[PDB]
């Protein structure tokens, strides 16, 4: 933990980008036959 | 984002990051250079005294590799093994239509000058000679390879296999440090002697002498555990190779299995040199392993592991893997494999089962479970979570960075 | 499926992986090869010298099996034993009405050349010799094929068996490993003797020396665990073979089921061949082993457990299997079968229970069907009463051994 740094602004920024990347995956159907997920079938703070 | 720009002051930046080359190597794309698997043995010199030169050469410190190779020449001409059948690969015929051959009709050569005793090590040794001797030499590759007490529980056993019609006692001195013998692993040619050895009696399954595989078998798909874990994860989740292919969920899983499943390889092929490629040399840097396939072989094993496999709970957890998206998409396959099960009447008589919100998907399609998957806001559910968390705890003994460990602690709790 | 493609560039794919051959071997389809079981014994030379070139080689890490071999062929012609009835088996007769006949008319060839000790090894041993010594020698093909403290029961036992009107002590020295002659058992013609001597006993049961069948009993469905580990299921399921088959609900538990089930191979057969199809060599690859019968064997075990079966607490959990999805189809049988009993009046004076006097409740009897049905009304997913069957069938187990269905059943169900 590098020292004199903010660390109240990194954690936030850190904590943040964690939470962006690992709350909402990556997935995707990758392989098929013919059939795959189509995605383009929430109102309120609910993440992005 | 090709072109990426600092705000405030307004001026460009190229985040560029130290380069990560290694390519890896195919079996095939490499009888594009060569047809035959050069197994350069020097000392085509006396059995008898080569056999000497070894069990000398071994109850002590010091034993030439190139010794042990050429006494395993020696020994492995059972020239047995009648090709019921025929036999190619990549091109190289190896025997058609009843064809006699033995170990070695994988392309033998002949090398340099440098050999350690005189004319005789002791004239003790009699023809107790292949019948372990070889087992025994060719049983310390696999205990070369390896690191904690299963050193001494590999070779503890990889020593009563010679006690096998055969019957006598044990060894060298030291227990291990992957040092002792285990040079004879970096050997380009007792590996290809090895990697031939099980090849042939993986073939001749039946033979006598086949009993040698005992260490020679961790040589077949050496370096090729993501493609092992693949066949583990459809032999766990019950489903076809090619559904099982369709639950990858990833760029970065999707791209390895495409590298994996590469065509003209012989992956598939009954007795290929694929499964080889490792220690014949054919590669030096396996497209099937786990290291190159670490996404694909952490989101196998973890989705196994939920399945409640038995391997994956000791599965390594690559590192540098986007572990938050692999988990995700294993816990789904998991989910889905493991709550709808595959139930179905088989036998009968005369009478049998005529079958025809947000509750989880009928069967295991990709996209139905997908599609439920983004109607549940993407982010997994309490009982899927709970099936996570009955799937781990209850399991103990969990070896730290193993896809076992990961698995514990991203759900019990 | 049979073509896969990946999505954003659109090119093909062929999941494909490392095949997986040793087929099965059956019995009969090999005496569709040779109609003769050979049984290669060498030296026919003096059986007092034998007998003792196998005491005293025995009591030291030296006595070569081609010796015991031959030693048994002498000790075991008891030519005793009257076919009561017929005998046949593969096409192979064996002995007709009454006829009288001895352990080895299961045919005999003999062999090579080389014989270590010279004539006479010591001549102390008389002929307190069939009495028990072969008895010691099959008994320890039973011994050779185990590795934990049952070694030493099988053996601490296996010699109490030679204290049988002989009386003695007990021989050779280092405990185990198998490695001492755990040997034995790669001979081909030791198993055959083995083989022979309990399928031969076997159909003699009655017989004095038939106390020899101790150690040579291990040979009878030597690898058809998943054979006998069906006959439980029904036994422990009181249900009817043909029913408990119907009860098979996965594509690769009824694939096994059918490779068991395959017809012409005296499976069912009083006294066959068959059982020992691996110690005679007729197989070299059984099909009813839990090896090549994982799926069914996992299965029928864990349902059997959950029906309160003893044996199945220790059965071991088989790898590369559909886990998920067999447990399921187990708990189910095993729900099924438990739940509703098989209560009937049997016995009565003029009086009894004519029995033809909700939503959900789970099905009346043990038909698959309703079950399934039952089931798929079910939403496909076990039931909390059936959970808690399940777990009340597993907690209270203990002593549970690792990778046993056992220890897979109460990790699975208690908590």
Same mark, same amino acid.
């Given at each position: ?16 980008? =964690? ?5 909402? =995956? ?19 703070? =609910?993440?992005? | ?18 380069? +990560? ?71 190289? +015929? ?91 692993? +970096? ?126 709970? +000791? ?99």
């Amino acid at each position: 933990q590098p020292d004199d740094i903010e660390y109240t602004s990194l954690t936030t920024a850190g904590l943040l980008y =964690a939470y962006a990347v690992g709350s909402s =995956a990556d997935l995707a159907q990758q392989f098929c036959v013919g059939d795959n997920k189509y995605t383009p079938d929430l109102t309120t703070n =609910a993440p992005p | 984002s090709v072109t990426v720009k600092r705000i405030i002051d307004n001026t460009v930046i190229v985040p560029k990051l130290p380069a +990560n080359e290694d390519p890896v190597e195919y079996p095939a794309d490499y009888f594009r250079k060569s047809k035959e698997i050069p197994l350069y043995i020097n000392t085509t010199k006396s059995l008898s005294d080569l056999r000497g030169y070894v069990y000398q050469g071994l109850k002590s410190g010091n034993v030439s590799i190139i010794h042990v190779n050429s006494y395993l020449y020696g020994a492995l001409k059972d020239i047995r093994g009648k090709l019921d059948k025929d036999w190619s690969s990549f091109g190289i +015929n190896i025997g058609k239509a009843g064809d006699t051959i033995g170990i070695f009709d994988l392309v033998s050569l002949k090398a340099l000058d440098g050999v350690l005793p005189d004319g005789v090590s002791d004239a003790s040794r009699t023809s107790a000679d292949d019948k372990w001797l070889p087992l025994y030499l060719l049983g310390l590759y696999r205990v070369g390879r390896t690191q904690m007490p299963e050193y001494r529980k590999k070779l503890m056993d990889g020593l009563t296999n010679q006690c096998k019609m055969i019957n006598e006692q044990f060894e060298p001195l030291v227990p291990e440090g992957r040092d002792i013998f285990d040079v004879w692993g +970096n050997d380009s040619n007792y590996t290809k002697i090895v990697a031939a050895v099980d090849m042939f009696f993986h073939m001749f399954k039946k033979h006598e002498c086949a009993s040698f595989r005992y260490g020679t078998i961790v040589s077949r798909f050496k370096d090729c555990a993501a493609l092992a874990t693949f066949g583990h994860l459809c032999k766990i989740t019950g489903m076809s190779t090619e559904d099982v292919t369709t639950w990858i969920l990833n760029r970065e899983v999707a791209d390895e299995m495409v590298q994996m499943m590469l065509p003209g390889q012989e992956i598939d092929k009954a007795d290929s040199y694929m499964p080889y490629l490792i220690d014949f040399g054919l590669s030096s840097k396996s497209p099937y392993s786990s290291v190159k396939n670490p996404a694909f072989h952490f989101w196998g094993q973890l989705t196994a592991l939920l399945l409640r496999s038995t391997r994956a709970r +000791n599965a390594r957890q690559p590192d540098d893997i986007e572990y938050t998206s692999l988990t995700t998409a294993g816990l789904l396959y998991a989910y889905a494999v493991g709550s709808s099960a595959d139930l179905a009447q088989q036998f009968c008589v005369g009478d049998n089962k005529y079958t025809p919100t947000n509750a989880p998907p009928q069967g295991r399609d990709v996209v139905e479970w997908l599609g439920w998957f983004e109607d549940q806001n993407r982010k997994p559910t309490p009982d899927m979570m709970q099936y996570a968390k009955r799937a781990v705890m209850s399991l103990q003994g969990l070896r730290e960075k193993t896809i076992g460990k990961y698995a514990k602690s991203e759900f019990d709790k």
